[PDB]
Amino acid sequence: SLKITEIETLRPEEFPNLLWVLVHTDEGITGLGETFYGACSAEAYIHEWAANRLIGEDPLQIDRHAKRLSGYLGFRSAGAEMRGNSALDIALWDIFGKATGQPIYQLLGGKCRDTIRTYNTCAGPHYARYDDLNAFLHRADELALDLLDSGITAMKIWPFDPYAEASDGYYISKSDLKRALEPFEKIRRAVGDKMDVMVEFHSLWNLPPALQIAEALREYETFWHEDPIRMDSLSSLKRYAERSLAPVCASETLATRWGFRDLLETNAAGIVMLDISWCGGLSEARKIASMAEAWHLPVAPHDCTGPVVLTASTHLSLNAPNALVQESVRAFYDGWYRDLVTALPTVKDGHITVPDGPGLGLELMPDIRERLTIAVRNT
Amino acid sequence: SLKITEIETLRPEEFPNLLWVLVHTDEGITGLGETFYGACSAEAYIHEWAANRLIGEDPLQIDRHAKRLSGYLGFRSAGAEMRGNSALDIALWDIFGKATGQPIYQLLGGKCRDTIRTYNTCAGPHYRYDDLNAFLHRADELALDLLDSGITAMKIWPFDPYAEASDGYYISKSDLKRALEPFEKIRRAVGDKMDVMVEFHSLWNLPPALQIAEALREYETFWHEDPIRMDSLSSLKRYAERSLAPVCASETLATRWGFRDLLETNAAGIVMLDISWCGGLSEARKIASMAEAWHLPVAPHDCTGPVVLTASTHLSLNAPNALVQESVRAFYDGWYRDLVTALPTVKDGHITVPDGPGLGLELMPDIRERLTIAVRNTSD
Amino acid sequence: SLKITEIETLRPEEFPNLLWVLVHTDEGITGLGETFYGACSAEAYIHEWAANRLIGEDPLQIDRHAKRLSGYLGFRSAGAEMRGNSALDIALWDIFGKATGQPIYQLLGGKCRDTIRTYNTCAGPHYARYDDLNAFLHRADELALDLLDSGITAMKIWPFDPYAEASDGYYISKSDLKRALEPFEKIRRAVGDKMDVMVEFHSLWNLPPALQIAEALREYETFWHEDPIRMDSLSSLKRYAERSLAPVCASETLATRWGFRDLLETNAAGIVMLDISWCGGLSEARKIASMAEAWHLPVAPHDCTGPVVLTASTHLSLNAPNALVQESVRAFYDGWYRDLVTALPTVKDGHITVPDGPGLGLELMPDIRERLTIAVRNT
Amino acid sequence: SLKITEIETLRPEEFPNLLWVLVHTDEGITGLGETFYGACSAEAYIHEWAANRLIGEDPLQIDRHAKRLSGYLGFRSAGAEMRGNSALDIALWDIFGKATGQPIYQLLGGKCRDTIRTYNTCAGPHYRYDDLNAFLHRADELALDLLDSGITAMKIWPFDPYAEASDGYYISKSDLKRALEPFEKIRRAVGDKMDVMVEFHSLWNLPPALQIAEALREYETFWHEDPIRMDSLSSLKRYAERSLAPVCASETLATRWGFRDLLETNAAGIVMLDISWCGGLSEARKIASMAEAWHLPVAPHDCTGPVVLTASTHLSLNAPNALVQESVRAFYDGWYRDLVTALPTVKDGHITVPDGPGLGLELMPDIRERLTIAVRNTSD
Ligand code: NA
Ligand code: NA
Ligand code: NA
Ligand code: NA
């Protein structure tokens, strides 16, 4: 059986939010993990604390390690400790898969579907003619027809974002509200009943303007409202949910079963959203999904980040019987993902599936440190 | 007037959990912050994200910056982001103090007392007061010794070693009775004269926690601290119901939002608070004044670095609902003494601030020479 | 360090609701406080009880004094004891500022904004062509266009007030209801989406007609409903909030953190309103604001009173990260404030800021006892 | 028929907390009111606002005026406005009584008893019954002495001096045992024969209140009165749960609305009530009849002036749920005697009204001569 010898972190300079982890074993089995945001603080944590708790150990003891890496502080949120733990955990699943010859979805309990429906989060490119941010801001009819043509039947937009800063999310003017409604009018004209529109709010709003916005959005029969208020105290959420026609999607900012227990006790969510690289790994995300199912709620795994999180989320979305949609960004997977990894999640007719092979079914391409400026670190 | 020019982090390898932060201004006024645990991750956060939000800004905009530094992730407990923010925050209060000529307790709203009662967390030294080993073995002696110096409260943690065998799901009846023996020793020695508060370190889950609390009922303990893990807080009222001692919670919790969640349980008796883990003096101000509305006392956490002990004592002097201030005698008579220009003074079981504006201390001016200190810098 | 030597109260005969307090020290630092309504009973309290508890003492011990002045009776409301305590407290903050060279907003924790948006409460003058009461009663289209022209984007009106007396707030007729709706129709025609309309109810209504009114107001998308029922037992409020499209604004009648704890436990308010001269001073108002923020609620500080309360509230509105609007009356600050104090809050383009200088940044003008008939009292 | 012509306030400087109010009519019928604490502020309120609402009106419209005098601010507890209103209210009931030839207890709905059981609040005299010092030191003796006159209940407050050292956030275990010593003395002296009710004066916050209540469990006390501050009432059920004695609350609370809030907690056992602080006989009528629906007894508060003691006794005779009537023997055998034409009679541990319409007393007709009395007047 395997022993963990070495942990490597990679911080690519041209994507400064991205962090890769490599876990090495004595038998030459290497796991790939990934998280996003606060790369340096996550990296610093893994070398300061986390690496010394798993060097020496069997990597297959995945539940034991997740519990062991749950530290004295930072357990109740998606902080640097949590994001570092989550990336480590994805890699341990990659090892598990390679050691057994099994794709991650099988190790989670088997697939329930061959593909899952995808939705396009309309972000623009990282440094394209997928300029989807400015396309929703100005040309949202055109973006909708374009998306529908490729077979994508769902999109996520965030036009209320600019109005948050002026008032610290305490106020939206009535005419600023109707201006931010204009993307919703445009796509209603263009494609109508054929597109699901998700609204993202980025946790930017407090309670009175959130309610005011939700009432204005009733007309447009939006698919979900994501993070409409900050998920700090969750007792404030039922107030929002009561007044929103669309279900609350919550929340990528939330970590672990305990974060999600707290959400499910509100009776306010309609969609349980998680990011596997923020929430405590595939380990916690496994268990969160199966909890959500007991409350009759679907899970939507978060991407919008690196290629590995998209792949790992897709594994979870293939496994979970309550999985609904898998988030993807067309600007990302046709764009800057392409150089970075040996295989990608395959998008066809508005649906997405895993790359073939054990574990993730991808690696970092062998010429990665030559292609990008990569700050590596070793323990 | 003031603009922030430069932020410095200091990591001494003799105390590798410890992080100092220095915030420099154009007019040559510098503030001192501190936080404890995960020093490299908190430092990396400061230089990665927080420093650029702060460099060039007015440091007196303390409420504004605390809100600005509340980033997209990690706001819901005491992670690297939260500890970095809190250290940064203490240093902003240090600046405010020296720019107005006022101590921190005044800028919080003035003192309500001259000194506050201290209690001794019976830890052993870092790098005599052999206080961990004293409570494990000779707990009668340690009690009598603390009473002689005038300290009328101790915190101990004798249930700790029994947690790891069972992951906090089980204690045997005989291991429970052997962990109770530190309580009987001091009952015979000092009796009425000492309060004893039990620290549990979040190590226990529900059934053995209840089983322990029932056993401790006899010994009339002063408080039960972090008796289960403070992750989902809904579970706490079940503990509180069955515990004669009030629950003290929690150094692990961050911000008004973490403490709203705690106050909603109706389960806490003492609101505990670490200013380096909870969102700075900024949040801890406000948590204290919230807790007063629920008729609860605040007890600020130390057992850590000297700057935290000093800043907490400032808070403990200001807050009308402050109960006790944690201190560790092996720390303030020991390894604190070399590192800073002044210390909080402990006399007759009671503690007060060093004199002067802000915190009323700086780091020793030759600190990089006595100690091996890894420095990092960010500037204009 | 300072010692308090003398407390003076001033009751100006021509504004009989107004009370000023002066706190004197040995070093010649003088603080200005202010409250409103029940001037004689507040004044009588400060000389009977409160003055003897703070003469001798350090004025900078502001938290200690607020707690010390919290007496055996009258702590749960905005009674004479509470209003006297609040005025004393503003003055102590004025001292604190002068002793340190700092404006009050800095002592509260710094500004978060340079100006705050103002809203015009449409009261008429105290004894103008700001006849704004009768302007909303008859000419509300004209008042709206006029307000918008000066750059003011929010107004507060109270047209339901006349109908309260006939039934003791237990009944409004359906046609009396539609007559009181006429101000809302008029401004909807005139300026439409450009004005926020706040409704004040003056705690005049009980539950069935309050609900009846709220349903009639749904159409007009009002900004908030202020004190729609009497804030005596707060358990009755969720019933109203459930049925009101507009958020409950509550309440200037409520005092201290304990009054506001009780409000926040209802889950019924959308806007936390306080008057610093009724609620326990800047001391309590500090802490109320930061409580409200934890429930995702904004604060709106009450004016409609004397110049000092407006100034002190503006200091709080500059400090509080959750501050929303600062109330002002154009008839007051262009009118009868002008003679009374050395500097005023400055209104420009629908926004308001503090006068410059330590503490409040104003004094009572040195020739005040010559300009007005002032009953002074000394301890 | 009747119109109010004139309202007079009387402030005697020998009893500076005390306020009398006299309401004069056109037909020469005058009513007597009273309130206690903050006399100058209550007086100033009466002449500033309340007198103009009342002068020229029918005094028999008692319900109408109580509602009319409920002003914009200060309705939510016992402030100057509330005490002024309550004094004004008692005087309106005095008028109603003399205009119909009926005592107040009848106009409330008739008596349910001839006398009511009294209990002695062990205060010392104003300006022998040295009853405060008696309970502090010689509590066995005071108990035996009260039992000889036939009084089978005392109220004491021995936890009071320990509050101010810690702002009610802390009691030491030894200070607790020394404050328990008044309870053990009377346990040995009279035992079963006395009920002892503990007054706490709203001085304690939550953890020490609970700690005290647990210690008092042994002594089977009759009630625990104002054991925490009655500001936000949500906090009370936590106390009630842990207290063997029922909670008595609260003289500090005003009106039906204050008492709805209390009754909603499910935490009170005895509804306590001061008619001069709570909104008059008008509100106290209705509070009593509310409390009966929750199966709770009312105990009206005195320890104050003679008119309040008389009016409360009227209430205690009327209310089917009246439990005891507070009286202080140092007051009614002492300084009350000079001031009024008649007093409530205490015999065999039981108290009743003076005979006659309204209250059944007036102020002594030469009162301005025996006492230095600051008068103020308002009229047509
Ligand atoms: Na999102
Ligand atoms: Na601790
Ligand atoms: Na108002
Ligand atoms: Na009493």
UniProtKB/TrEMBL annotation, chains B, D:
Pfam families: MR_MLE_C (PF13378), MR_MLE_N (PF02746). Keywords: Lyase. SMART domains: MR_MLE. GO terms for molecular function: lyase activity. InterPro entries: DgoD-like, Enolase-like_C_sf, Enolase-like_N, Enolase_C-like, Mandelate_racemase_C, Mandelate_racemase_N_dom. The keyword 4Fe-4S does not apply. Residues 136-246 form the Mandelate racemase/muconate lactonizing enzyme C-terminal domain. PANTHER family: D-GALACTONATE DEHYDRATASE, D-GALACTONATE DEHYDRATASE-RELATED. This is Mandelate racemase / muconate lactonizing enzyme. It comes from Burkholderia pseudomallei (strain K96243).
